[PDB]
Paper text:
Considering that histidine is a slightly positively charged amino acid at physiological pH, we assumed that a histidine to valine substitution in H3K36me3 would enhance its binding to PHF1/19. Indeed, the H3K36me3-H39V mutant peptide exhibited approximately twofold enhanced binding to PHF1/19. To gain further insight into the leucyl patch interaction, we also determined the crystal structure of PHF1 in complex with the H3K36me3-H39V peptide. As expected, the trimethylated lysine 36 is inserted into the same aromatic cage. V39 instead of H39 is located on the hydrophobic patch mimicking H3tK27me3-V24. P38 is structurally conserved in both complexes. Taken together, valine is a favored residue type at this position, which could snugly complement the PHF1/19 leucyl patch. In summary, the valine residue is an optimal residue in the recognition of the PHF1/19 Tudor domain.
The three human PCL proteins all contain a single Tudor domain followed by two plant homeodomain (PHD) fingers and an extended homologous (EH) domain. The Tudor domain-containing PCL proteins are essential components of the PRC2 complex that maintains gene repression, and the Tudor domains of PHF1/19 have been identified as readers of H3K36me3 in vitro. In this study, we provide structural insights that the Tudor domains of PHF1/19 are also able to recognize testis-specific histone variant H3tK27me3 via a conserved aromatic cage, a salt-bridge, and a hydrophobic surface, and both H3tK27me3 and H3K36me3 engage the same binding surface of PHF1/19 but are bound in opposite orientations. In the complex structures, PHF1 and PHF19, adopt a classic Tudor domain fold with a five-stranded antiparallel β-barrel.
Numbering used by the authors:
A (entry chain A): 27 to 85
B (entry chain E): 31 to 42
């Protein structure tokens, strides 16, 4: 099926405080179903696919 | 971003 997440995509990621933060996907890890997401302070963390939403879908 | 600050899209 058409990929939902990809490298370079602007996304909202749910963090461990239960809140959403703007980020950019830097790496997709398919086996682990995670992406390395770079946040607005340039910190980079693993987030599960289900906790990532695309910022914009064309539509 | 260089110098950036994380803020949540919404606060509690």
């Amino acid at each position: 099926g058409r990929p939902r997440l990809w490298e370079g995509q602007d996304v909202l990621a749910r963090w461990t405080d239960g809140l959403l933060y703007l980020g950019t996907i830097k790496k997709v890890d398919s086996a682990r179903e995670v992406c390395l997401v770079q946040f607005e302070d340039d910190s980079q963390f693993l987030v599960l696919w289900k906790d990532i939403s695309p910022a914009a879908l064309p539509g | 971003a260089t110098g950036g600050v994380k803020k949540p899209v919404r606060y509690r």
